[PDB]
Amino acid sequence: GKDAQAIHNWLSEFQLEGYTAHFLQAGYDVPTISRMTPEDLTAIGVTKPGHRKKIASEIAQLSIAEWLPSYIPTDLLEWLCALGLPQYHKQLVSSGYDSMGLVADLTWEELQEIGVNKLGHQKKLMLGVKRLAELRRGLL
Amino acid sequence: GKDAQAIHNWLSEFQLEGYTAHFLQAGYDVPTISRMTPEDLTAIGVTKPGHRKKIASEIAQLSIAEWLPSYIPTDLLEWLCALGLPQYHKQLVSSGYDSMGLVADLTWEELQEIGVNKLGHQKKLMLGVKRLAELRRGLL
């Protein structure tokens, strides 16, 4: 198991790791767990109040989000972080590409005065744009 | 370096790994490399014809795509693979959620006769739907 070893690690930091299989059988992984509620834990069989209280508390301390597991960037900076290019955010913003909907229409010739000059970052970004467009038209 | 060790590994499988820094300085990573052309390799300074011929050939043999690095799913199955839920594709298709644009309007009550019954897979999917909607309205 691959996310099992992520759960088992996190549950071990407070000696509740014998609940690992509870999250597995329910299909959960760590980022989804971070958004459960107490009733969700009850639903998957965490019924002992002493343990459900403690797992809830330990979940609020989980501060790793937000486009995991979905992998849908909602805003521009999230997306440049999916890609490995957050260093370009504020160049894109100074040039008026400050939203997903506007970035989708960015074009190969703007790139030089925005400041994306390494050709690999150039290509990676424009492939992201191209197929971001392909996803908008996907709604009809 | 993290994708450097991915390049250095792949270039080593044909003893050309001393080109690793060429791809780094240009910002490339493996999935972007897989889409380069010969002129792209020239541009980043792979100028010796014997090596550029061989790296090109070795790139066509790279068959790992397609939403990496972009992390924008273009079609429904890609997206259920971003998430860890491809086992549900054909249930979603038998129920008429066979595109991104239609999935974006899937709702919590359909889930039982589609066949998504593990609550963690339920939550993971509906978070993906919710924020997929949030991304469509993002285009105005």
Residue numbers in the entry:
A (entry chain A), B (entry chain A): 21 to 160
Quote the study's own text.
CASKIN2 and its mammalian homolog CASKIN1, are multidomain proteins that share the same overall organization. The amino terminal half of both proteins consist of protein-protein interaction modules, namely six ankyrin repeats, an SH3 domain, and two SAM domains. Using the CASKIN2 scaffolding protein as a focus of this investigation, we have demonstrated that its SAM domain tandem is able to sample monomeric, dimeric, and oligomeric states.
The structure was subsequently solved at 2.75 Å resolution from a SAD dataset acquired at the Canadian Light Source Synchrotron. A single SAM domain tandem was observed in the asymmetric unit. Despite having ~60 % sequence identity to CASKIN1 SAM tandem, we observed a different oligomeric architecture in the crystal structure of the CASKIN2 SAM tandem. In contrast, the CASKIN2 SAM tandem presented here forms a domain swapped dimer where SAM1 interacts with SAM2 of a second molecule and vice versa. The intra-SAM domain contacts within one dimer and inter-SAM domain contacts between dimers follow a head-to-tail type interaction that has been observed in many homo- and heterotypic SAM-SAM structures including, but not limited to AIDA-1, ANKS3/ANK6, Ste11/Ste50, LEAFY, Liprin-α/Liprin-β, Ph/Scm, Shank3, Ship2/EphA2, TEL, and Yan/Mae. While the SAM-SAM head-to-tail interaction is predominantly hydrophobic, ionic contacts serve an important role at the intramolecular SAM-SAM interface of the dimer and the intermolecular SAM-SAM interface between dimers. Specifically, ionic contacts were observed between D527/K610 and D516/K611 at the intramolecular SAM1-SAM2 interface and between H538/D585 and K540/D592 at the intermolecular SAM1-SAM2 interface. A hydrophobic network with contributions from W554 and Y558 and peripheral support from L555, together serve to restrain the linker in one conformation in the crystal structure. Near the linker, an ionic contact (E565/R618) from the SAM domains across the dimer interface further add to the compactness of the assembly. In the crystal structure, the C-terminal segment of helix 5 in SAM2 extends to G658 and makes contacts with a similar segment in another dimer.
